[PDB]
Amino acid sequence: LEVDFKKLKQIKNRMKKTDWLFLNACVGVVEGDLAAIEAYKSSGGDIARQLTADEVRLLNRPSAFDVGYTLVHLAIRFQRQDMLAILLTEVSQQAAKCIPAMVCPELTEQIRREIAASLHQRKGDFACYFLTDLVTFTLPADIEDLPPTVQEKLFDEVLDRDVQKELEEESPIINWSLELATRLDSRLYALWNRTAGDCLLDSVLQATWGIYDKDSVLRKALHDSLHDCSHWFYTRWKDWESWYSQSFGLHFSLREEQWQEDWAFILSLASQPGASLEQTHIFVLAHILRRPIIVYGVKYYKTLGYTRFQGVYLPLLWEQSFCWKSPIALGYTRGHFSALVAMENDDVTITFLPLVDSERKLLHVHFLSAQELGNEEQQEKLLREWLDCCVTEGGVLVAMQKSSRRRNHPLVTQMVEKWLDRYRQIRP
Ligand SMILES: [Cl-]
């Protein structure tokens, strides 16, 4: 009760939002208020921040606070294990990883808002969600101007090096062509994302607006799309399932009554948070982005198991004229999706993405209705309707992903510039 009010007043004066968020969090951990600590966490504020004596004065809880205490110390002193785990994961990542969406949480929240505003549900008979902007992420060419040691640090902090090594060194999943990766400057980079599930959604957003799926906006759209378009996707799925077993030469069958339950479940997948999503979900996402999604993944991983994720996901249920030709690329390893992005040409950047594997075999086109199956001649013809394709000098069939500096989204540009500032200001 005995507070020097003059002193207090002077202190409060010099305080900004992030100070209040810090001090609120300090009380938060005393009190067991997880929102108070999440709120500080998502501000991007240093979880290592230590209480100053002024802050201790302002707080006025002798039993609880002292100069030098951090949130982590408060969390041990009181019994908040929950919080400790969040705190320590945050600290670990902050030191190993620094991606564009973490550099300025207010701006990434503006980006989220812009994506939400851009997202609508089609009226009429096919009530699928859809975006209204075409946005594609490329690493900035300015990276090449960094000092070598700074480049490696930047790559350590934005790439998933483990995923890169399995897609590129351990087997020829990506960058297997000298021509594409080097002569034509189309080397692909696997962006890191946290594995706490939802890698699919985080990956699509990273390939696209450069952020993760904050506050689950993309996910809810995906969920509501599947639910409100159930019968549309159900039919494509049923054939996709039969497609497979068709390939082992095995003649099977299910009772309509039973396709039903198997459908109801994958329907729950999008609602149950952090569960695993499968190819039907990639298919729906291609509709929501109004563009193709190419997935590169192992040819057969476990070999205890064959894989069926690799291939091309076309937004087949829209009119072609409704859809952009430019695709995004995702990499698939062991139950995990990664955004695969190229570096900008060092005007227009053209990234050449192969529509064949390293053995030059056409990638699979998923969810094709039997009325669409056909020769390799015919498949390729389909791919040419939906993508902007050409054949390299070396003979590789590729889809082109074209982007322009001019057409880049301004908030994305600002975020990428601020992320680069962190490396540009490093001496040496
Ligand atoms: Cl149904």
Residues paired with residue 131 on neighbouring β-strands, in sequence order: 119
Give the whole-angstrom CA distance, residue 22 versus residue 17: 9
Structure tokens at 37: 């600590």
CB 420, CB 146: distance < 8 Å: no
Task: Say how many Å lie between the CA of residue 128 and the centre of ligand 1.
Answer: 15
What is the CA angle 140-145-147, rounded to 5?
125
DSSP 3-state assignment of 147?
A: coil
Give the whole-angstrom CA distance, residue 76 versus residue 81: 7
Give the whole-angstrom CA distance, residue 412 versus residue 428: 27
Give the whole-angstrom CA distance, residue 126 versus residue 122: 7
Helix H or strand E segment including 239: helix 230-247
Residue reference for tokens 């969040």: 86
Residues of the chain with CATH 1.25.40.560: 1-96
Task: Say how many Å lie between the CA of residue 332 and the centre of ligand 1.
Answer: 29
Give the method of determination: X-ray
Task: Say how many Å lie between the CA of residue 252 and the centre of ligand 1.
Answer: 20
CB 146, CB 423: distance < 8 Å: yes
Give the whole-angstrom CA distance, residue 119 versus residue 221: 8
Structure tokens at 171: 């087997």
- Catalytic one among 223, 336, 366, 409? 336
Give the whole-angstrom CA distance, residue 139 versus residue 44: 23
Q: Pick 1-96's CATH classification: 3.40.50.360, 3.40.47.10, 1.10.443.10, 1.25.40.560.
A: 1.25.40.560
Phi and psi based region of residue 363 (left: phi greater than 0; alpha: psi -120 to 50; beta: remaining): beta
Residue 366 DSSP class: T
Q: Is residue 389 flagged as an active site residue?
A: no
Give the whole-angstrom CA distance, residue 137 versus residue 133: 13
Burial of 4 (0-12, 13-18, 19+ CB in 10 A): exposed
- Catalytic one among 199, 229, 281, 287? 199
CB 331, CB 384: distance < 8 Å: no
Resolution of the structure in the document, Å: 2.2
Residue reference for tokens 């399932």: 241
Task: Say how many Å lie between the CA of residue 233 and the centre of ligand 1.
Answer: 9
Residue reference for tokens 């040819």: 299
CB 198, CB 219: distance < 8 Å: yes
Q: Is residue 199 flagged as an active site residue?
A: yes
CB 355, CB 395: distance < 8 Å: no
Task: Say how many Å lie between the CA of residue 117 and the centre of ligand 1.
Answer: 30
